[PDB]
Ligand binder design. Structure first.
Ligand SMILES: [Cu+2]
Ligand SMILES: [Cu+2]
Ligand SMILES: [Cu+2]
Ligand SMILES: [Cu+2]
Ligand SMILES: [Cu+2]
Ligand SMILES: [Cu+2]
Ligand SMILES: [Cu+2]
Ligand SMILES: [Cu+2]
Lengths: 476, 477
């Protein structure tokens, strides 16, 4: 009934690789946890909400010595909480104030591709800016924004470009849940970085099988501590490393109630003392500190290494509210042969999707919008422990259902919608996919060095009432 | 603890189930700034007595952005000002009539001597003439209101534009933690439905015996109302002052409403909810909190899927949040036994009848000794079969009462506090606990005003056993 173990096949974990790097608990002061500021609108005129977002340089005190040269959204590093609302329209002004081209990929949002998507087709030259419009129609969930150029996605994210996104659909939201951002409701944006005189050098730490960093960050903070002012606490976890798998445990094995995955809430909640997330996998979780006095620390650790210390303070309210046994209604009853097939293969430099690398001008698949197709994403690495690797399939422009893993029921927290799934070596994952808008989307391994090296294919979501010519140019 | 994500009353008997119901049309005008009713300044304070003058008058109000709209109003063109009382005080009121027909001043909420001070259908003020009245006030901290209650034009007159919010602060039960800065962190939300004929209100045209409905929603006589929130906590004093329309208040972002009070003062404990339903005259004081909102973000409040008020978040000047006690007000509720009174509300359209009889102004329909706690059994004999039924709100003059039971089950979560107006669903027996404090003749009537007019009104005598006053009843109607 209670889960006390990490989910994916241990034999293929990251630490088996020959160029892994353990996390080093840094000898710095416990820093206070940085909450990303809420992005105010520039104006509201109707059902349209206006947003401006500068991607810009800056210097951030992360260590207690020098500043660190960082890139960031509307800031020095990282980015603000960008709230959307299902059933609204949004005009965004994407300013580029970096010295190289960037994009704005809305990892989670189901908006037209490839321009709004912010995939490798929506470049913004330095100095220049861009405007975009899109409706939003999807469930209540946590998304995020990262650059997705070609082929420098990895470098950019490393530099410090990431930002949490919150998409509240009034129709499936639970406002019982802690919603006081910063107090009872916080992000946990896990990242791994190496410091060279308090500076991040991507070129130095680069590895084509995934760039690892010896120090863990949390919302751009190191040795982060957070004072819990309230009994319930909703963490919105996110692995935004380039490769590192996030193995989240606690030093007192506090029960984590996972209420949501990437693409919205789970049918039912899932209690567990530990959790593994691959790159870009989100998890919304609830902890309860009723049975703790004041001053008691609860350390959260990536693997062996502390990353966030939850210090119990004087509770101001009681913010515990009854939840429904069924968090969200989802039809899962769908059988039949897969009408699509994705064969992820190779490691290091052998990374390829269905034998091919990425061609920006090519369409690699087509699927009618609105229809429920079944995909078969697989991984042909060596299952023999140590030989294998865990690739996470991400798909733009859609949330999908995990139906099965090699015929068997998916892990207990995979019944809810997902836009990012882990694929173990020798595993056939069968997904149920439906595209709501039309347009060109990507599907790619979300280890960002694999993406850069061509583990990226495109799909056209076709409207049957508007066959569209796509004139797609290569940009690299 | 749970969060209420639903209205309360039986959906099968909602207003929209009427054959000739009218959906609310969002009117196509410019967003208007919400009109806050000015404070009623005293005319003089000498001692424990505060002097008040109130002219009911005509005028012309800019509601739509084209032509003016002929309105009736208290000390103004439309509606009226915030009238403040204070428990344990005496008040001399000069009620001036500057209308072209007879009106009264019914103080809906106040527990003052009937039927002259009450402003019931016995306290007419002929045009041009005026009246003076004296009364103490001794009741809890609560939101009341003033509407005209003549025979039988109560409905017409309210429609013309006669209403006013009333605030009664008893020092003994008042919570000064709560936002008290009227116009800033503390505002009314007087919901009214009206139809415009070339920017003009025609009651006669829109009249229906089963309740007059209007295609446009007003809020403090404002249309497309916006209000700038200059502060984190905001205390709305919600009031349905329509003739029939039931106010189903919801938000498109499901902001939690913490109900602190009902009609007759505060609730024992606060009640969080994302939605709420109020029948006519039912008042609800609620708290919204905008902590988790940046600046510029709109929060729409809508009546049954039609916006009525846009709360725009502005630059907070203060933090006005203050910890509230788990118990907002202590109330004895433990009271058993057989009902010593019975009210049988029956009929729709013009079948409206209390215990089989219509309204007779010269007849006393019941008697109860003051001070004592009697139990009533208000009920409704409409058809429970969905569609076929109607929700009648029982109002009683001169008293606040406690809802004990609804068909033997506990009352809705926000009905433990005192009330002067209760909804009665079809097939429902509501058992109330009532006590009159002053003596005098009071009404009890359905507060759909076109029923009150057709004659869904009965009278009760509140009898002082020690000092009876002989009652001779004459009809003006
Ligand atoms: Cu994405
Ligand atoms: Cu991504
Ligand atoms: Cu991507
Ligand atoms: Cu890969
Ligand atoms: Cu009334
Ligand atoms: Cu009354
Ligand atoms: Cu009345
Ligand atoms: Cu009635």
């Amino acid at each position: 009934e209670l889960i006390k173990n990490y989910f994916f096949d241990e034999g293929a974990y990251d630490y088996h690789d020959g160029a892994y790097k353990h996390l080093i608990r840094p000898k710095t002061k416990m820093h206070k946890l940085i909450i990303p500021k809420v992005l105010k609108a520039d104006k509201i005129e109707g059902n349209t909400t206006y947003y401006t977002i500068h991607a810009q340089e800056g210097e951030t005190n992360i260590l207690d010595g020098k500043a660190t040269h960082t890139w960031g959204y509307n800031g020095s590093l990282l980015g603000p909480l960008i709230r959307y609302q299902s059933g609204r329209h949004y005009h965004l002004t994407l300013v580029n104030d970096l010295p190289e081209v960037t994009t704005w990929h809305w990892h989670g949002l189901n908006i037209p591709g490839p321009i709004e998507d912010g995939g490798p087709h929506a470049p913004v030259l330095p100095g220049k800016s861009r405007e975009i419009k899109f409706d939003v129609n999807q469930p209540t969930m946590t998304a995020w924004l990262h650059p997705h150029p070609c082929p420098h996605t990895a470098e950019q994210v490393w530099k410090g470009l990431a930002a949490p996104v919150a998409v509240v659909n009034p129709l499936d939201d639970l406002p019982q849940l802690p919603h006081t951002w910063g107090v009872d409701d916080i992000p946990l944006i896990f990242q791994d970085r190496t410091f060279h005189d308090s500076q991040w050098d991507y070129q130095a730490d680069y590895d084509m099988d995934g760039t690892l960093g010896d120090t863990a960050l949390v919302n751009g903070t190191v040795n982060a501590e957070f004072t819990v002012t309230r009994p319930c606490l909703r963490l919105r976890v996110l692995n935004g490393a380039n490769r590192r798998e996030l193995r989240l445990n606690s030093d007192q094995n506090i029960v984590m109630t996972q209420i949501a995955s990437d693409g919205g809430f789970l049918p039912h909640a899932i209690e567990m003392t530990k959790i593994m997330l691959t790159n870009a996998e989100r998890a919304e979780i609830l902890l309860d500190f009723s049975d703790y006095k004041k001053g008691d620390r609860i350390v959260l650790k990536a693997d062996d290494v502390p990353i966030l210390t939850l210090k119990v303070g004087e509770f101001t309210e009681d913010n515990r509210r009854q939840l429904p046994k069924t968090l969200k209604q989802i039809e899962r009853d769908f059988t039949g042969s897969p009408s699509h097939q994705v064969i992820m293969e190779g490691m290091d430099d052998s990374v390829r999707i269905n034998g091919k690398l990425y061609d920006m001008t090519r369409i690699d698949d087509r699927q009618e919008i609105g229809k429920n197709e079944i995909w078969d994403v697989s991984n042909t690495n060596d299952s023999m422990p140590g030989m294998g690797m865990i690739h996470p399939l991400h798909m733009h422009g859609t949330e999908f259902l995990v139906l099965s893993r090699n015929g068997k029921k998916p892990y207990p927290n995979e019944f809810g919608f997902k836009d990012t799934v882990a694929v173990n070596p020798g595993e056939h994952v069968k997904l149920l996919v439906k595209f709501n808008v039309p347009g060109i989307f990507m599907y790619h391994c979300h280890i960002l060095e694999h993406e850069d090296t061509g583990m990226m294919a495109q799909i056209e979501a076709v409207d049957p009432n508007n066959p569209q010519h796509w004139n797609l140019k290569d940009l690299c």
